[PDB]
Each structure stands twice: as C-alpha cells, then as structure tokens.
Amino acid sequence: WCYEVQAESSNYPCLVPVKWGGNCQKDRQSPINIVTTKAKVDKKLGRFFFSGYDKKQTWTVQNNGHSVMMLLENKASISGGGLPAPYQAKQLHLHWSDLPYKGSEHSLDGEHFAMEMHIVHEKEKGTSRNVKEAQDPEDEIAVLAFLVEAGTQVNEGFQPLVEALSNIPKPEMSTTMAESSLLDLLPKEEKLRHYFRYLGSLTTPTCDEKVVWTVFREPIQLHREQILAFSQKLYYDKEQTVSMKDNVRPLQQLGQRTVIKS
Ligand SMILES: [Zn+2]
16 A cells, blocks of 8 residues: 555555555544644543653664654553553654645644654553444554644754664664653653544554544644654665655544544
8 A cells, every 4th residue: 555645656556545445435534634623622631641651762663664663562651641541552653744734644723744643552451342342442542643843953852763764764674773762752741731532543554443542732843854854864665766755644534523622
C-alpha cells in the first residue's frame, strides 16, 4: 500500500489511500478535522499518568519504508486521562512533510501542522466481553498524538532521534539511538492538561477501528532544520531517489461520532 505522493513516483504498483483494503473503507476512521468549538467538555477526562517515560535509555529505531519508528517494547505505560485501564507503550513514529502547513494527519479548525507524532499503546490486561459484540474492542489500542510546528530554539530533546536518521536512509534499516527518555520528546507536563478525545481507527492498513485517540492541544516545537532533517535524510525507495515526506492519510468523515475535550 502507498501514500499518494509515493505512488506517483514509485517504480511498481501499489494501492493509494482511496483504494486501500481492510476496514479502511468503514465508518469510524481517522484522521479527522477537529472543530475545537463543537467538542463537548467532560470532567471525567482527568490528567494522564506516565510510568517509565523519564528513564534515559537506548532505543531501537527503524525505517519501515513508511515512516521512522522506534520500538518501545512495553518499557513504559500510561493511565488516567479517562482511560478505563493502563496501557503499555509498544511503538512510536511520525508523519511529516517539507511544507509547514501540510505535515499532520489531524487538523484543528482546518489548520494542519509541520508533523504529527503517534505513541501507540495497548490495553494492559484482558477484560471479559460478550461474543455478540464487535470482534475487536473499540478502545483496544490507545494512541497519543502530538502536533509539531517550527520554532526558534533547537530542541535538544529531539537531537538524539534526529542524529539516528543518518544511519537508516533506506527501508528495512535499523540502529540504536543515543540514550534518551520518552519525556525528552513531549512538552512539559503542565501543558498536557488540555486534549481532545474520540474513538477511531489506525491511519494505515488494515485501519482497524479499535483505537481511542487523544490529541493534545499544545504543539511540540522543533527548529525548522530539525523538521527538514526527516525529509532530507529518509527515502521511500532503496535506490535513494524518493524522499520520505507527505506520509499522511487524507482526512476522513466524523459521521455519527462526537468529540469531547478536557
Ligand atoms: Zn501513525
């Protein structure tokens, strides 16, 4: 499967977003545009609690041909934020572009940002459900999304990741980034108080609708050069001819769903 941009310049067939298979053609898809003013306020949406997010550590990061992804190996978890139970971190990856107004999947009141970061987690234990219900739990996977925009200061917390890119230009490559903690990436805990919530799917095949999304309103800031690093050092093909950018899924319709916030 492919993103539009790469389908045009690829040397072999591939399904574009509108022609994706799986549950990608269903009714509870992501990303969506969030009309901040239409989202209902909910008190049950308390703050989140992080475990392991602060310990420096080496991570395995890799170029899967669709994005840059670092494996989290259940070495951290979250709770609170209205979540019915703890969720352990599996992986993290990003979506970006070289133009400041078209790098994120979700949008706020029609505005798109430089990049978007997805931290995927899965429900801790298994809870009893009835056979008659939907096969997969609608809140099975919990992802945290952060919007990224250009700033003046060089973001030191992202430096290790940016460096690592040099070692994985082509697909299938891997490496070990310098010791860092997940907390080094996110903004200060006090800014993580406001966020939007809604049920949806994954933004890649098979687009399974078993995700509880969380989009924080506070954007992470990176120096322009740091953002461009991704487009400049990563490639979609082994021949190193097509830069990796615009790896974003076109918006989907909200439908019967409603969004709530804190
Ligand atoms: Zn993603």
